[PDB]
Design an enzyme around this catalytic site. Structure first.
Site, PDB file in Angstrom:
ATOM      1  N   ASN A 191      -2.020  62.239  41.895  1.00  0.00           N
ATOM      2  CA  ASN A 191      -3.337  61.981  42.238  1.00  0.00           C
ATOM      3  C   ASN A 191      -3.215  61.473  43.646  1.00  0.00           C
ATOM      4  O   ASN A 191      -2.581  60.345  44.055  1.00  0.00           O
ATOM      5  CB  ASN A 191      -4.212  61.030  41.319  1.00  0.00           C
ATOM      6  CG  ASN A 191      -5.457  60.764  41.618  1.00  0.00           C
ATOM      7  OD1 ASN A 191      -5.838  61.178  42.672  1.00  0.00           O
ATOM      8  ND2 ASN A 191      -6.383  60.674  40.561  1.00  0.00           N
ATOM      9  N   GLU A 217      -0.712  68.996  32.068  1.00  0.00           N
ATOM     10  CA  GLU A 217      -1.440  68.820  33.114  1.00  0.00           C
ATOM     11  C   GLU A 217      -1.416  70.034  34.130  1.00  0.00           C
ATOM     12  O   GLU A 217      -2.232  70.431  34.863  1.00  0.00           O
ATOM     13  CB  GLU A 217      -0.334  67.981  33.884  1.00  0.00           C
ATOM     14  CG  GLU A 217      -0.284  66.417  33.174  1.00  0.00           C
ATOM     15  CD  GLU A 217      -1.894  65.835  33.566  1.00  0.00           C
ATOM     16  OE1 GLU A 217      -2.420  66.333  34.209  1.00  0.00           O
ATOM     17  OE2 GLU A 217      -2.042  64.685  32.970  1.00  0.00           O
ATOM     18  N   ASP A 226      -5.708  66.307  42.524  1.00  0.00           N
ATOM     19  CA  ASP A 226      -4.159  66.247  41.678  1.00  0.00           C
ATOM     20  C   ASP A 226      -3.410  67.226  42.203  1.00  0.00           C
ATOM     21  O   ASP A 226      -3.809  68.560  42.169  1.00  0.00           O
ATOM     22  CB  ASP A 226      -4.511  65.977  40.201  1.00  0.00           C
ATOM     23  CG  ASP A 226      -5.128  64.907  39.686  1.00  0.00           C
ATOM     24  OD1 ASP A 226      -5.164  63.949  40.322  1.00  0.00           O
ATOM     25  OD2 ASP A 226      -5.409  64.840  38.336  1.00  0.00           O
ATOM     26  N   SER A 286     -10.614  62.955  45.345  1.00  0.00           N
ATOM     27  CA  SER A 286      -9.338  62.701  45.415  1.00  0.00           C
ATOM     28  C   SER A 286      -8.854  64.324  44.714  1.00  0.00           C
ATOM     29  O   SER A 286      -9.575  64.981  44.163  1.00  0.00           O
ATOM     30  CB  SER A 286      -8.664  61.913  44.563  1.00  0.00           C
ATOM     31  OG  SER A 286      -8.995  61.714  43.317  1.00  0.00           O
ATOM     32  N   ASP A 309     -14.181  61.901  42.452  1.00  0.00           N
ATOM     33  CA  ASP A 309     -14.203  61.046  43.332  1.00  0.00           C
ATOM     34  C   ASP A 309     -13.960  61.573  44.914  1.00  0.00           C
ATOM     35  O   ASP A 309     -13.736  60.773  45.837  1.00  0.00           O
ATOM     36  CB  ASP A 309     -13.460  59.865  43.007  1.00  0.00           C
ATOM     37  CG  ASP A 309     -12.184  59.939  42.696  1.00  0.00           C
ATOM     38  OD1 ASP A 309     -11.631  61.152  42.932  1.00  0.00           O
ATOM     39  OD2 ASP A 309     -11.254  58.888  42.672  1.00  0.00           O
ATOM     40  N   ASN A 344     -10.853  66.198  41.824  1.00  0.00           N
ATOM     41  CA  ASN A 344     -11.598  65.069  41.084  1.00  0.00           C
ATOM     42  C   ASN A 344     -12.915  64.655  41.602  1.00  0.00           C
ATOM     43  O   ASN A 344     -13.296  64.998  42.644  1.00  0.00           O
ATOM     44  CB  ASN A 344     -10.658  63.946  40.834  1.00  0.00           C
ATOM     45  CG  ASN A 344      -9.262  64.043  40.376  1.00  0.00           C
ATOM     46  OD1 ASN A 344      -9.155  64.758  39.465  1.00  0.00           O
ATOM     47  ND2 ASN A 344      -8.296  63.619  41.154  1.00  0.00           N
TER      48      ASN A 344
HETATM   49 CL   LIG Z   1      -0.898  61.107  37.708  1.00  0.00          CL
HETATM   50 NA    NA Z   2      -4.347  63.913  32.919  1.00  0.00          NA
END
Ligand SMILES: [Cl-]
Ligand code: NA
Ligand SMILES: [Cl-]
Ligand SMILES: [Cl-]
Ligand SMILES: [Cl-]
Ligand SMILES: [Cl-]
Ligand SMILES: [Cl-]
Ligand code: NA
Ligand SMILES: [Ru+3]
Length: 129
Positions: free
Chosen positions: A59, A35, A52, A50, A48, A46
């Site tokens: 998120n 990650e 992370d 959002s 959309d 992201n």
């Molecule tokens: Cl997550």
């Molecule tokens: Na992921």
């Protein structure tokens, strides 16, 4: 902060992730590796809108507030910036909520695609803990 592999394993154990919801420590280390590459400051936007945040790429669509994800929730009741700290407490506490929501670690796409079903114990091999 960019953690070392065994350093993060020890911190996650201290913070209660070892076998949390039945997921062994290596699952959590593997998820963090793919990650964030163990970087607490990692952020990724992201499609959309959002974003992370942090070692486990939590998120803003559901879990934290960043003030710029319209219609989202803040189920961990934290600013997303708290997920970027050198201390992993906020990320761990929020991850515990995520992994308890019904889908387990499948919430983390990198875990499903790169850790699930593999020899995840290799991620903690040799570590003092
Ligand atoms: Cl997550
Ligand atoms: Na992921
Ligand atoms: Cl304790
Ligand atoms: Cl928002
Ligand atoms: Cl599960
Ligand atoms: Cl998948
Ligand atoms: Cl494989
Ligand atoms: Na949010
Ligand atoms: Ru700590």
């Amino acid at each position: 902060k960019v953690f070392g592999r065994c350093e993060l394993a020890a911190a996650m154990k201290r913070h209660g992730l070892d076998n949390y919801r039945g997921y062994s420590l290596g699952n959590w280390v593997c998820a963090a590796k793919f990650e964030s590459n163990f970087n607490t400051q990692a952020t990724n936007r992201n499609t959309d809108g959002s974003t992370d945040y942090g070692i486990l790429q939590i998120n803003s669509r559901w879990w934290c507030n960043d003030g710029r994800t319209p219609g989202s929730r803040n189920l961990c009741n934290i600013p997303c910036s708290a997920l970027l700290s050198s201390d992993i407490t906020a990320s761990v506490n929020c991850a515990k909520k995520i992994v308890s929501d019904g889908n387990g670690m499948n919430a983390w796409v990198a875990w499903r695609n790169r850790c699930k079903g593999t020899d995840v114990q290799a991620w903690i091999r040799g570590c003092r803990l």
